[PDB]
Amino acid sequence: QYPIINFTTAGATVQSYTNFIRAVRGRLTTGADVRHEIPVLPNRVGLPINQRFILVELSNHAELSVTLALDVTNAYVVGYRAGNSAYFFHPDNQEDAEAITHLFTDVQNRYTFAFGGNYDRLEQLAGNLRENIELGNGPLEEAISALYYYSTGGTQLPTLARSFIICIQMISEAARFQYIEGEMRTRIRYNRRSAPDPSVITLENSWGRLSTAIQESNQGAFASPIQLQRRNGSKFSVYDVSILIPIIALMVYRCAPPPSSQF
């Protein structure tokens, strides 16, 4: 039912990763909602269940496969399947709890984690912050194996949490931000793993606020500036959507677009 996008870390290149992220974005957004050249994800309100999720089938060089389920309203990884078992993060509400029952319906073993899938929770479980977790093709290769072996006792909880953190940034955050996609492309090109710098972290942290600021803007102009960080940790002030067009690829729906109001 739900669309499937395939990616493998086995012999991954800049091009194969680029193809993957483009395909993810294409399945996340319909094209109905583009504001200041930036696409918006579907509104949760009234979204039919048959259009709610996409599936990302990840394979690795170790010949293992896991399937991530992404919510189209926010690109969130809501859970995963590995063989005979599926695991879902603790739902935020009753609607989301019902929604995830439509995922991996033929799986033998269904589990819901007591913990939510937000970075705060995952970092505390990993025993490491995002700033200290290496990203790249190698980390993703290893993350796929760690997710695969969790149900059989091969993967400790901190490793599982770390592996989710890797997957989320390399898939969901890359889909949300061309800038983060670019940072992952660089890591793949040189096959060099590294933790995300402050520019990546602050973009991740600011996605909701940037989405709202753009959508509530007066003709693109923010009422309040948003502070981001450069690679060296120094401040970068955002006053307008214009500077974000090469940076952000998709936004969460936050408000209705104001009438065209052309002069």
Curated annotation (Swiss-Prot):
Annotated binding of a carbohydrate, by residue: 4-6, 11, 46, 137-142, 191-193
Biotechnology: A deglycosylated form may be linked to monoclonal antibodies to produce immunotoxins exploited in cancer treatment. However, a point mutation should be introduced to eliminate vascular leak syndrome, a side effect resulting from endothelial damage.
Residues modified by glycosylation: 6, 232
Binding, AMP: 76-77, 117-119
Reactions catalysed, as given in the entry: Endohydrolysis of the N-glycosidic bond at one specific adenosine on the 28S rRNA
Active-site residues per Swiss-Prot or TrEMBL entry: 76, 119, 173, 176
Job of this protein: Acts as a glycosidase that removes a specific adenine residue from an exposed loop of the 28S rRNA (A4324 in mammals), leading to rRNA breakage. As this loop is involved in elongation factor binding, modified ribosomes are catalytically inactive and unable to support protein synthesis. Can inactivate a few thousand ribosomes per minute, faster than the cell can make new ones. Therefore a single molecule can kill an animal cell.
Name of protein: Ricin A chain
